[PDB]
Design a protein around this motif. Structure first.
Motif, mmCIF file in Angstrom:
data_model
loop_
_atom_site.group_PDB
_atom_site.id
_atom_site.type_symbol
_atom_site.label_atom_id
_atom_site.label_comp_id
_atom_site.label_asym_id
_atom_site.label_seq_id
_atom_site.Cartn_x
_atom_site.Cartn_y
_atom_site.Cartn_z
ATOM 1 N N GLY A 11 42.129 51.924 35.807
ATOM 2 C CA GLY A 11 42.853 50.426 36.064
ATOM 3 C C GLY A 11 43.827 49.956 35.474
ATOM 4 N N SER A 59 46.483 46.748 42.981
ATOM 5 C CA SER A 59 47.711 46.593 42.180
ATOM 6 C C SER A 59 48.669 45.719 42.885
ATOM 7 N N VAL A 85 38.004 52.203 36.393
ATOM 8 C CA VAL A 85 38.654 51.869 37.473
ATOM 9 C C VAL A 85 38.741 50.391 38.108
ATOM 10 N N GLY A 134 35.578 49.869 44.063
ATOM 11 C CA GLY A 134 36.619 49.851 44.959
ATOM 12 C C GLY A 134 37.148 50.677 45.632
ATOM 13 N N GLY A 135 38.143 50.731 46.431
ATOM 14 C CA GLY A 135 38.965 52.023 47.167
ATOM 15 C C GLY A 135 39.195 53.181 46.186
HETATM 16 N N1 LIG Z 1 46.352 54.267 37.735
HETATM 17 C C1 LIG Z 1 46.820 54.284 39.130
HETATM 18 O O1 LIG Z 1 47.652 54.967 39.674
HETATM 19 C C2 LIG Z 1 46.276 53.115 39.871
HETATM 20 C C3 LIG Z 1 46.434 53.374 41.001
HETATM 21 C C4 LIG Z 1 45.628 52.381 42.002
HETATM 22 C C5 LIG Z 1 44.961 51.395 41.467
HETATM 23 N N2 LIG Z 1 45.092 51.160 40.276
HETATM 24 C C6 LIG Z 1 44.312 49.874 39.521
HETATM 25 O O2 LIG Z 1 42.921 50.541 39.675
HETATM 26 C C7 LIG Z 1 41.971 49.184 39.481
HETATM 27 C C8 LIG Z 1 41.136 49.307 40.934
HETATM 28 O O3 LIG Z 1 41.869 49.247 42.189
HETATM 29 P P1 LIG Z 1 40.985 49.101 43.357
HETATM 30 O O4 LIG Z 1 40.003 50.051 43.579
HETATM 31 O O5 LIG Z 1 42.146 48.989 44.528
HETATM 32 O O6 LIG Z 1 40.405 47.490 43.159
HETATM 33 P P2 LIG Z 1 39.159 46.771 43.899
HETATM 34 O O7 LIG Z 1 38.881 47.312 45.221
HETATM 35 O O8 LIG Z 1 39.487 45.416 43.469
HETATM 36 O O9 LIG Z 1 37.962 47.382 42.992
HETATM 37 C C9 LIG Z 1 37.667 46.980 41.711
HETATM 38 C C10 LIG Z 1 36.310 46.907 41.475
HETATM 39 O O10 LIG Z 1 35.736 46.477 40.102
HETATM 40 C C11 LIG Z 1 34.776 45.777 40.238
HETATM 41 N N3 LIG Z 1 34.578 44.881 38.979
HETATM 42 C C12 LIG Z 1 35.188 43.873 38.592
HETATM 43 N N4 LIG Z 1 34.877 43.542 37.415
HETATM 44 C C13 LIG Z 1 33.984 44.207 36.796
HETATM 45 C C14 LIG Z 1 33.126 44.515 35.852
HETATM 46 N N5 LIG Z 1 32.944 43.615 34.565
HETATM 47 N N6 LIG Z 1 32.261 45.534 35.688
HETATM 48 C C15 LIG Z 1 32.254 46.480 36.778
HETATM 49 N N7 LIG Z 1 32.808 46.466 37.778
HETATM 50 C C16 LIG Z 1 33.587 45.289 37.862
HETATM 51 C C17 LIG Z 1 34.740 44.800 41.489
HETATM 52 O O11 LIG Z 1 33.534 44.227 41.906
HETATM 53 C C18 LIG Z 1 35.074 45.904 42.282
HETATM 54 O O12 LIG Z 1 34.434 46.679 43.197
HETATM 55 C C19 LIG Z 1 42.989 48.226 39.848
HETATM 56 O O13 LIG Z 1 43.420 47.864 38.177
HETATM 57 C C20 LIG Z 1 44.374 48.673 40.102
HETATM 58 O O14 LIG Z 1 45.524 47.951 39.823
HETATM 59 C C21 LIG Z 1 45.599 51.925 39.578
#
Ligand SMILES: NC(=O)c1ccc[n+]([C@@H]2O[C@H](COP(=O)([O-])OP(=O)([O-])OC[C@H]3O[C@@H](n4cnc5c(N)[nH+]cnc54)[C@H](O)[C@@H]3O)[C@@H](O)[C@H]2O)c1
Ligand SMILES: NC(=O)c1ccc[n+]([C@@H]2O[C@H](COP(=O)([O-])OP(=O)([O-])OC[C@H]3O[C@@H](n4cnc5c(N)[nH+]cnc54)[C@H](O)[C@@H]3O)[C@@H](O)[C@H]2O)c1
Ligand SMILES: OCc1c(F)c(F)c(F)c(F)c1F
Ligand SMILES: OCc1c(F)c(F)c(F)c(F)c1F
Ligand SMILES: [Zn+2]
Ligand SMILES: [Zn+2]
Ligand SMILES: [Zn+2]
Ligand SMILES: [Zn+2]
Lengths: 374, 374
Positions: free
Chosen positions: A293, A48, A268, A201-202
């Motif tokens: 996500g 984010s 996610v 991801g995380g």
């Molecule tokens: N709802 C909430 O409160 C909240 C909190 C934290 C994070 N987020 C969101 O959650 C998402 C993930 O965050 P993160 O884990 O830190 O991100 P991150 O570490 O970038 O993980 C994202 C994962 O998605 C994978 N990916 C990308 N495109 C695709 C696809 N087309 N198909 C399948 N996998 C794909 C990518 O390879 C990566 O491993 C982001 O959009 C954040 O903004 C939301």
């Protein structure tokens, strides 16, 4: 001694989209009534925060970003009752005012005092505690953790265990709690169920942790980066699939794999197409899909409402559905009692001065969480 | 006198979209194994039957429509165990095979043997029991109740109380059970809550009945036909709003009226725009919206997933979420015990032969339910 005085410290200021953070001196005002000034100890790099850089998330600039962190209270303003100087704390990017209809609701956590929906980039009082080169700098989500010192509203901070390792529990400020709660609290994953987790991801790994804690029998990780699969399996994924390996759309693959659709799916990543895929791949009569996500600002998805009419449930949540100030201390206590692990999410530990390098590790696909240490 | 024999009888055959039904002689084959031939007694006119006429709902033509009905078993095929000749029955447009993963799930009702998702217009064995002018005629949802006699699979019929008034309880075969269940079982409306019901036809009136049964403190009816408001208030609406009376979109009106959004909203019309409006008007952190209306064939809605990310739950359901064969006899027993009323839904009674007049009454906006008597 700094109490009641302006602090000059180091922070990572974002002056404009799609540029590196500028690590430079800022002035941090002392806290006003019902405000808390915190010396940062550790902050995670969440996707984010990168969304602010990339323009996926729109928030007023210039800004001090950062929302996943832990630190020690330096001073409190008049009227603060819930923390004191020297307390370990986690800033809460979703506040808990305790007074709004959401805070009073048994299942609401998205407090009406949040600065997410319609970001102002200020304190609750509509002003900023930050200046840099004579210019006012915006806050981010009431937290602004990419600074040696921040000021937050009392409703945006939780006191945590004095023996907490802050370089680990900072992840309870966003990515762990978000993913774990998305599974255990928002989806309410059931024992014996089949789950699909899109994005490893995380946050997605934390969703896997929660699915496994809830007793899922099968947890299918989905990612286009196969380098993410080994750690997904370590924390509970039973299978991993890469959509790029298939001629068919992945919703069809996952529906086949699950003999007619999964019980629970989680988006996610932050893509409109994967939100619709994730919904589609849950069983049409009783499946549940959770959006976690964050996709690009002001973009609508397209979907056929027959997906819902047959009986699917589609929901989303901020911060895993947890009421932030009640839950963060309990989650830290549960971590201290070895009820879950945080180390699997931490791939890199860098000084704060290497924030840009930490964002490059996330963008390149190498890292899960980089923890920056002050 | 007719067991094992072809029956010649009258049915309302739809040869072409956007045309009157043709009341004419059809041949009704005897029941095969695990089939039941029913002498129809009463059938309601539901808007979903009109959708077949308009092409909103695509199903193979020519067809005998009708799915909200009650009758008396004329004969049973080999191996039938759950009904006998002379039993009062309600055909089940959503079957309950009792064997599939959905039927076995505690919250599933959209049995995998349904003919709704991808309509064939046949019996379970892929053939038709109906001939007209020497041509095979499609079934509709395995029920085809617009006929003096129909043949249904055993999984598509429920035995009901022998003392049932069939000209009332036919409504348990679709509109009442759908609307009531959508409130009490799918949404799980809570005591003291605020509800918004979009569409005040027979199904939306039944939603209001359920929201009132559940103890809702406020039930806001929404319809563009203000002639619908008086009956909506009689069955429990606390207030009614016509979107055409307002300069602002009704989701904004309803959010204001509910001091920040409703607890529960229901789309009971069948329009993509009102599905998104209904979602929007529920409180952003903990609101629930249920899609009940049938959308136009193959059309996608557009929506911003931030509506869900904040905490909203969006779901839909067929037949109020009720497992059909378990639930229909219990609903009839409850009606017999005066636990709910059906008369408020019945505005017109006609003989079957006046089916086209009954459809005119629905299209004009005059009727709620017209009950046709054979
Ligand atoms: N709802 C909430 O409160 C909240 C909190 C934290 C994070 N987020 C969101 O959650 C998402 C993930 O965050 P993160 O884990 O830190 O991100 P991150 O570490 O970038 O993980 C994202 C994962 O998605 C994978 N990916 C990308 N495109 C695709 C696809 N087309 N198909 C399948 N996998 C794909 C990518 O390879 C990566 O491993 C982001 O959009 C954040 O903004 C939301
Ligand atoms: N999910 C299910 O199992 C199920 C069961 C039965 C009916 N249905 C569907 O539910 C819907 C309602 O059926 P019904 O009650 O028989 O129909 P109906 O009697 O036609 O009632 C629909 C109501 O919607 C009103 N309306 C039309 N347009 C608008 C608008 N733009 N805003 C507000 N009100 C408007 C209209 O005036 C009428 O009173 C139809 O789409 C059916 O196909 C679904
Ligand atoms: O990662 C947590 C997180 C969110 F879930 C958002 F929706 C958001 F807008 C944001 F800025 C944020 F940091
Ligand atoms: O009114 C009940 C009803 C539905 F809810 C449908 F989704 C549908 F396709 C149909 F044919 C039907 F009759
Ligand atoms: Zn609040
Ligand atoms: Zn985050
Ligand atoms: Zn079944
Ligand atoms: Zn119907």
């Amino acid at each position: 001694s700094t109490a009641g005085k302006v602090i000059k410290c180091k922070a990572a200021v974002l002056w404009e989209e799609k540029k590196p953070f500028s690590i430079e001196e800022v002035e941090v005002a002392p806290p006003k009534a019902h405000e808390v000034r915190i010396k940062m100890v550790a902050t995670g790099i969440c996707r984010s925060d990168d969304h602010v850089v990339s323009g996926t998330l729109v928030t007023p600039l210039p800004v001090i970003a950062g929302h996943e962190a832990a630190g020690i209270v330096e001073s409190i303003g008049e009227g603060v009752t819930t923390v004191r100087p020297g307390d370990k704390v986690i800033p809460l990017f979703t506040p808990q005012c305790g007074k709004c209809r959401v805070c009073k609701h048994p299942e609401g956590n998205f407090c009406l005092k949040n600065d997410l929906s319609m970001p102002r980039g200020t304190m609750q009082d509509g002003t900023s505690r930050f200046t840099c080169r004579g210019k006012p700098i915006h806050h981010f989500l009431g937290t602004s953790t990419f600074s040696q010192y921040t000021v937050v509203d009392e409703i945006s901070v939780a006191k945590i265990d004095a023996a907490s390792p802050l370089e680990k529990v900072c992840l309870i400020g966003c990515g762990f709690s978000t993913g774990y709660g998305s599974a255990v609290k928002v989806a309410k994953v059931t024992q014996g169920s089949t789950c699909a987790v899109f994005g490893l991801g995380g946050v997605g790994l934390s969703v896997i942790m929660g699915c496994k804690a809830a007793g899922a029998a099968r947890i299918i990780g989905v990612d286009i980066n196969k380098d993410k699969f080994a750690k997904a399996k370590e924390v509970g994924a039973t299978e991993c699939v890469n959509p790029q390996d298939y001629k068919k759309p992945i919703q069809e693959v996952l529906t086949e794999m699950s003999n007619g659709g999964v019980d629970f799916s989680f988006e996610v990543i932050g893509r409109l197409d994967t939100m619709v895929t994730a919904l589609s791949c849950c069983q049409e009569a009783y499946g549940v899909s959770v959006i976690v996500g964050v996709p690009p600002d002001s973009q609508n998805l397209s979907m056929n409402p027959m997906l819902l009419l047959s009986g699917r449930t589609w929901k989303g949540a901020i911060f895993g559905g947890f009421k932030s100030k009640d839950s963060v201390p309990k989650l830290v206590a549960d971590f201290m009692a070895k009820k879950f692990a945080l180390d699997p999410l931490i791939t890199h530990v860098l000084p704060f001065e290497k924030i840009n390098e930490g964002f490059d590790l996330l963008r390149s696909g190498e890292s899960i969480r980089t923890i920056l240490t002050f």
